[PDB]
Amino acid sequence: KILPLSKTSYNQFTNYNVFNVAHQETEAEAKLEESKHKIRQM
């Protein structure tokens, strides 16, 4: 019976297998490097 109400705190969803989390990517450079390479080549 979860009624996750606290005016002083917020409860964490404490069911996350911490061992298999916090490693997505973004890596803009994954492709920008290629764009820029071509540009340098240009």
Partner: protein, 48 residues
């Protein structure tokens, strides 16, 4: 009461075969996706 304990034990065993199933499906979709991302690397052949 023993049957209840059996029942719970076996239910946990049933989960195992089904964890194997979930991981089989979850891992597999990612495997396909990052086979698809090999073309990021073929598009790195492009760098070549």
């Amino acid at each position: 009461q023993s049957l209840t304990d059996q029942i719970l034990s076996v239910e946990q065993r049933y989960k195992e075969k089904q964890e194997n199933l979930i991981r089989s499906e979850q891992i597999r979709r990612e495997e396909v996706i990052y086979n698809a991302e090999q073309k990021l690397s073929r598009q790195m052949k492009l760098e070549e």
